[PDB]
Design a binder for this molecule. Sequence first.
Ligand SMILES: [Cl-]
Ligand SMILES: [Cl-]
Ligand code: NA
Ligand SMILES: [Zn+2]
Ligand SMILES: [Zn+2]
Lengths: 30, 30, 30, 30, 30, 30, 21, 21, 21, 21, 21, 21
Amino acid sequence: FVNQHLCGSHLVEALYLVCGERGFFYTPKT
Amino acid sequence: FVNQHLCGSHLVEALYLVCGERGFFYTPKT
Amino acid sequence: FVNQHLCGSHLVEALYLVCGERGFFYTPKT
Amino acid sequence: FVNQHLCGSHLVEALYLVCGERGFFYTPKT
Amino acid sequence: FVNQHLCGSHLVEALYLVCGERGFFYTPKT
Amino acid sequence: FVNQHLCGSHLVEALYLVCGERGFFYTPKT
Amino acid sequence: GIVEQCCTSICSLYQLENYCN
Amino acid sequence: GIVEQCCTSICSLYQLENYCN
Amino acid sequence: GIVEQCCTSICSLYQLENYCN
Amino acid sequence: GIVEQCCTSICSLYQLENYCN
Amino acid sequence: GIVEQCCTSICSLYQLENYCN
Amino acid sequence: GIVEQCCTSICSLYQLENYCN
Ligand SMILES: [Cl-]
Ligand SMILES: [Cl-]
Ligand code: NA
Ligand SMILES: [Zn+2]
Ligand SMILES: [Zn+2]
């Protein structure tokens, strides 16, 4: 697979695609 | 603000907008 | 709720989410 | 250009692309 | 990675994420 | 119609809208 | 209107242009 | 849960806020 | 306007409500 | 093909990779 | 190419039609 | 974190898997 910059909502749409059923967390504060 | 019909990626995009840099969990059933 | 930068199509998707049934106008010329 | 099936946010994203910085109104029924 | 239900623009967005700067073809039937 | 900058996934969503049934290719390497 | 026609039926980009400012 | 309620039914932005960190 | 307010600078969802019909 | 399989059925990201250049 | 044309510079929807099959 | 890793710098889909539940 390939890399690149994912920012704002593009990052959570990528998480959605990757994780889907499993769910994910999005924590920009960490 | 109005009521929403939100499926798939659109739900996560809405969470991103509502929660922002506070972050969020996405936890579907199964 | 939280703030941040919304540009291009992200701004009108945010308007859609916020306004929904009511509709909105998007006028970058003002 | 081809015919489109456009629901929800996708309709507003298409308006954004078609109208651009001329801007647009989004006026659903009810 | 999980299985996906991907329609419309969402299929092309997933191709973009999976293929990246390698690029891709989008070839629907008819 | 109008112009403007289309980058990342926004470019392939624009291709999808424009081309639809016909399909398209996205080749950033050219 | 257009919102319903695009979603329930189909519409063209040329039709969408009518909602430009 | 929310994922199902927003999609199968409807939900408010105020409901979505409950999933903020 | 909305671009200058929500894009170049930041804006709240409540300000975006200013642009609802 | 893939466009139909992803939408009517389901598909994997590994399947989508086959349409990469 | 398309990136240099529609992203780094701007492009019209008619130019994007150049990349339809 | 994820922002610093996948946004400011670049990241792979495998790294994004780190943030699945
Ligand atoms: Cl962007
Ligand atoms: Cl959809
Ligand atoms: Na999108
Ligand atoms: Zn974007
Ligand atoms: Zn959608």
